[PDB]
Design an enzyme around this catalytic site. Structure first.
Site, short mmCIF file in Angstrom:
data_model
loop_
_atom_site.label_atom_id
_atom_site.label_comp_id
_atom_site.label_asym_id
_atom_site.label_seq_id
_atom_site.Cartn_x
_atom_site.Cartn_y
_atom_site.Cartn_z
N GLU A 357 0.82 -1.21 0.00
CA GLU A 357 0.00 0.00 0.00
C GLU A 357 0.85 1.26 0.00
OE1 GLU A 357 -3.19 -0.66 -0.58
OE2 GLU A 357 -2.47 -2.73 -0.48
N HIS A 487 -15.87 -11.26 -10.06
CA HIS A 487 -15.57 -10.37 -11.18
C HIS A 487 -16.22 -10.84 -12.48
CE1 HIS A 487 -12.33 -9.49 -8.25
NE2 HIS A 487 -12.38 -8.27 -8.76
#
Lengths: 596, 49
Positions: A357, A487
């Site tokens: 991150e 997805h």
């Protein structure tokens, strides 16, 4: 009147308002996520829909401009980005029905209740529970039953929605000067700028599978080893020459084989690398973890982080009644504002996630040089590649020993290195055929090359052909397994995960070659490498202005899409698996099934 | 502007004053302070009253 010159004023005026409006919307989003309360919901909805209702007129006005004489490549790209009409072309009935089907299938996919037939009062969700059933289990019936339930009470109603969703999407693609919607999802993988850097949507259709066949023998060795381990663990259930069942893959849909590492552990004598005990004994709290990880970009060459991100962003311990979301998000709120939203804990996996991150944040502050509409990557495979590069680097035990997080008297040998390499490759490269086959199925179902009936039987056949997973129970057309995935029903382009992995190893090998490192690629470390920092930052700041073909020229040696580094990375693993399955045949054939 | 305290480096409001000196042929009125020392009596000294 000239329109090429007048476009600059309109673009600047639009950008001036877009900056602060999107900034306010992003701040509303961060407030809604950080403070889970009714107050932050209305402000979220107002900010989001006001931003959309402001961008709609900007899109509407961006059609009178004759985008056929703009010699400024950046201006032309920005205008064509604003020239996009989205889904505002259909009639009111068709557009509102499209919104309705999107919302209803999003709701339905999240409301999958599956109860045990003998006790129909205890259903389970995709949340922990039904997922935990296949997360780590040593049995056969409890997996096939749960798989069939999840793909029957959820896999039967998604097909009627998905059929008309597909036909409406194809109709919109036809109305948008696209032969099929695959080109619409392949628009991101296209650049037609300077000579030598030109690319097309149809080129990727072929280029996806040319670079996939060079790792097929390695995947066949992996499949043979996994199958042999399965017979060693599940006797008289899997044919040695055939393939493995569907519910024994390890996941809800067998996307990864992370949960199969424990079942198929190479050597249980050598433990895996874990330094959480080092952090706990040394009292490395969340702030110490983040601070010690902050030095890595400085060693590589990236500048120090900007003050203020600490105060605006929360890190750890939501704590009391004031709840907060734990979903890992790196907010680029605009105006140079960055924030972090994690729930940090003392864990090696948390160390890697924090590295990923903060690498995302570094990339964010890197491409800040580009304007508002160019503050994005050339494609979707660049952000995640940069994020996972530092995770791979921090997974190296050499960096762990260098920072004093491990005893300097370590005696690492080939056994533990091979074990860690196998643990990595069980997910790094094993899921590549899965992603490739799913993307090819979506391409061929949006291309209209197959009828509605020939949707899943072909899917199962080429799933068996490419990966080697057969039906535990025969299926008819009333089932729909692909739509029973995250997805597939929320309009998510699934090709990003395929190309990002190829970019990861390319960038890693480029850094290793411009890092003065000699030895195995898996043990390559980029710590204290100031020469790789400039190489990375030369393209980290390029953003969407420059072509992805040009983007893959400042780090990697060549822009061609070849799988060079994956084979080099698991080379000790390749030679350790080669002298393992000497007798068992490598590969599989699509004519065995558990039911037959 | 859209100035906010949450804004990053360079996005914050900065107050700037530019001072320009002009010396037209008119008699000067603006000059800096002049340091004045102490005085000593009954000693042969040179002075600048």
């Amino acid at each position: 009147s000239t329109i090429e010159e007048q476009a600059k004023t309109f673009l600047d005026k639009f950008n001036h308002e877009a900056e602060d409006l999107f900034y306010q919307s992003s701040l509303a989003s961060w407030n809604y996520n950080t403070n889970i309360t009714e107050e932050n919901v209305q402000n979220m909805n107002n900010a989001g829909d006001k931003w959309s209702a402001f961008l709609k007129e900007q899109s509407t006005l961006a059609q009178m401009y004759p985008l056929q004489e703009i010699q400024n490549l950046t201006v032309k790209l920005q205008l064509q980005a604003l020239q996009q009409n989205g889904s505002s072309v259909l009639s009111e009935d068709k557009s509102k029905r499209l919104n309705t089907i999107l919302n209803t299938m999003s709701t339905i996919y999240s409301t999958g209740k599956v109860c045990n037939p003998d006790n129909p009062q205890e259903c389970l969700l995709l949340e922990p529970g039904l997922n935990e059933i296949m997360a780590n289990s040593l049995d056969y019936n409890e997996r096939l039953w749960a798989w069939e339930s999840w793909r029957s009470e959820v896999g039967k109603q998604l097909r009627p929605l998905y059929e008309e969703y597909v036909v409406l999407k194809n109709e919109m693609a036809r109305a948008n000067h696209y032969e099929d919607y695959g080109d619409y999802w392949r628009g991101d993988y296209e650049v037609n700028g300077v000579d030598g850097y030109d690319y097309s949507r149809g080129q990727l259709i072929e280029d996806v599978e040319h670079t996939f066949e060079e790792i097929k023998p390695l995947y066949e060795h992996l499949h043979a080893y996994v199958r042999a381990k399965l017979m060693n663990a599940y006797p008289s259930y899997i044919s040695p020459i055939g393939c493995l069942p569907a519910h024994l893959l390890g996941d809800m849909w067998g996307r990864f084989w992370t949960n199969l590492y424990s079942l198929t552990v190479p050597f249980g004598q050598k433990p895996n690398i874990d330094v959480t005990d080092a952090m706990v004994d040394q009292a490395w709290d969340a702030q110490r973890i983040f601070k010690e990880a902050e030095k890595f970009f400085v060693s590589v060459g990236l500048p120090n982080m900007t003050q203020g991100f600490w105060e605006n962003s929360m890190l750890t311990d939501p704590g009391n009644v004031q709840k907060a979301v734990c979903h890992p998000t790196a907010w680029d709120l605009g105006k140079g504002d960055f924030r972090i939203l994690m729930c940090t804990k003392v864990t090696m996996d948390d160390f890697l996630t924090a590295h990923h991150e903060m690498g995302h944040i570094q990339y964010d502050m890197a491409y800040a040089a580009q304007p508002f509409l160019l503050r994005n990557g050339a494609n979707e495979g660049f952000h995640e590649a940069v994020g996972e590069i530092m995770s791979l680097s921090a997974a190296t035990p050499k960096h762990l020993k260098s920072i004093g997080l491990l005893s300097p008297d370590f005696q690492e040998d080939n056994e533990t290195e091979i074990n860690f390499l196998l643990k990595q490759a069980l997910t790094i490269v094993g899921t590549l055929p899965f992603t490739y086959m799913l993307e090819k199925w979506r391409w061929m179902v949006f291309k209209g090359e197959i009828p509605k009936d020939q949707w899943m039987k072909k899917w199962w056949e080429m799933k068996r052909e490419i990966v080697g997973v057969v039906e535990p129970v025969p299926h008819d057309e009333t089932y729909c397994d692909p739509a029973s995935l995250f997805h597939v029903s929320n309009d998510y382009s699934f090709i990003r995960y395929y190309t990002r992995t190829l970019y990861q190893f390319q960038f890693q090998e480029a850094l290793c070659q411009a890092a003065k490192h000699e030895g195995p690629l898996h043990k390559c470390d980029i710590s204290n490498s100031t020469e790789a920092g400039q190489k990375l930052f030369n393209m980290l700041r390029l953003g969407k202005s420059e072509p992805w073909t040009l983007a893959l020229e400042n780090v990697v040696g060549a822009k061609n899409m070849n799988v060079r580094p994956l084979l080099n990375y698991f080379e000790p693993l390749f030679t350790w698996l080669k002298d393992q399955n000497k007798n068992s045949f490598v590969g599989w054939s699509t004519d065995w099934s558990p039911y037959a | 502007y859209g100035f906010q305290p949450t804004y990053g480096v360079g996005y914050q409001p900065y107050r700037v004053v530019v001072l320009s000196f002009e010396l037209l042929h008119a008699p000067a009125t603006v000059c800096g302070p002049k340091k004045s020392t102490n005085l000593v009596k009954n000693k042969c000294v040179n002075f600048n009253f």
